[PDB]
Design a protein around this ligand. Sequence first.
Ligand code: SF4
Length: 60
Amino acid sequence: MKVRVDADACIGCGVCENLCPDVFQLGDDGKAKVLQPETDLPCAKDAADSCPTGAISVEE
Ligand code: SF4
C-alpha cells in the first residue's frame, strides 16, 4: 500500500507520525518519507486520504 515513496512531494506537515509509527512517521532531517514499505497496518488505508503528499503509494 506504500511501495512508491514521494519525497520531493512530502512537505513536512505531520500527517503520518500521527497516523501510525509503523510506516507513517518522520526522521530528523525533516523530510517525512515512508519508513515502512508494505505497511499492511490499518492506518495507511486512511493515510491515503490523509497524507497531503500522496507519497505513500500502493504498489502492492
Ligand atoms: S503526512 Fe505525508 S506530507 Fe505530511 S509529513 Fe507525513 S509524509 Fe510528509
